[PDB]
Design a protein around this ligand. Structure first.
Ligand code: CHT
Ligand code: CHT
Ligand code: CL
Ligand code: CL
Ligand code: CL
Ligand code: CL
Ligand code: CL
Ligand code: CL
Ligand code: CL
Ligand code: CL
Ligand code: CL
Ligand code: CL
Ligand code: CL
Ligand code: CL
Ligand code: CL
Ligand code: NA
Ligand code: NA
Ligand code: NA
Ligand code: NA
Ligand code: NA
Length: 129
């Protein structure tokens, strides 16, 4: 599923992500934009052999199991394929764990490089939320 901006904002709010760990909804929408272009089915292989999955590009090195990342962990206790669903619940639940692990949203390098410090409220501008 490819979400619209306001549609994704609403789904993220519906699942408890707005202001989770102090990160406003615009931060989460901005991260999803630059991680996946709002596409729940996005997958990208990393040079180390792990793969990032879904709307928030969650890594199989630590967070989900894909059966092909030797030496990795599965800290969200989910198959990585569950992070590709049209329903964002699994990605949201896992992102809540990631953002709580100590470095906040810096875990998402694209958030640090493209969203952090910017006018992230522009991502939810005009949305009926
Ligand atoms: C090891 N990480 C910090 C990357 C995640 C585990 O908490
Ligand atoms: C302009 N964008 C839609 C790209 C972000 C909100 O300002
Ligand atoms: Cl899709
Ligand atoms: Cl929309
Ligand atoms: Cl914030
Ligand atoms: Cl915001
Ligand atoms: Cl994801
Ligand atoms: Cl594995
Ligand atoms: Cl694990
Ligand atoms: Cl699994
Ligand atoms: Cl959803
Ligand atoms: Cl923080
Ligand atoms: Cl991580
Ligand atoms: Cl507005
Ligand atoms: Cl709207
Ligand atoms: Na957009
Ligand atoms: Na990424
Ligand atoms: Na893994
Ligand atoms: Na295996
Ligand atoms: Na700002």
């Amino acid at each position: 599923k490819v979400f619209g901006r306001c549609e994704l904002a609403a789904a993220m709010k519906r699942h408890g992500l707005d202001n989770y760990r102090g990160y406003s909804l615009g931060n989460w929408v901005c991260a999803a934009k630059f991680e996946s272009n709002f596409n729940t089915q996005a997958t990208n292989r990393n040079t180390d052999g792990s793969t990032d999955y879904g709307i928030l590009q969650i890594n199989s090195r630590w967070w989900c199991n894909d059966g092909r990342t030797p030496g990795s962990r599965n800290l969200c206790n989910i198959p990585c394929s569950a992070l590709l669903s049209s329903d964002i619940t699994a990605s949201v639940n896992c992102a809540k764990k990631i953002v709580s692990d100590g470095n906040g949203m810096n875990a998402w390098v694209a958030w640090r490089n493209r969203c952090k410090g910017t006018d992230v409220q522009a991502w939810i501008r005009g949305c009926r939320l």
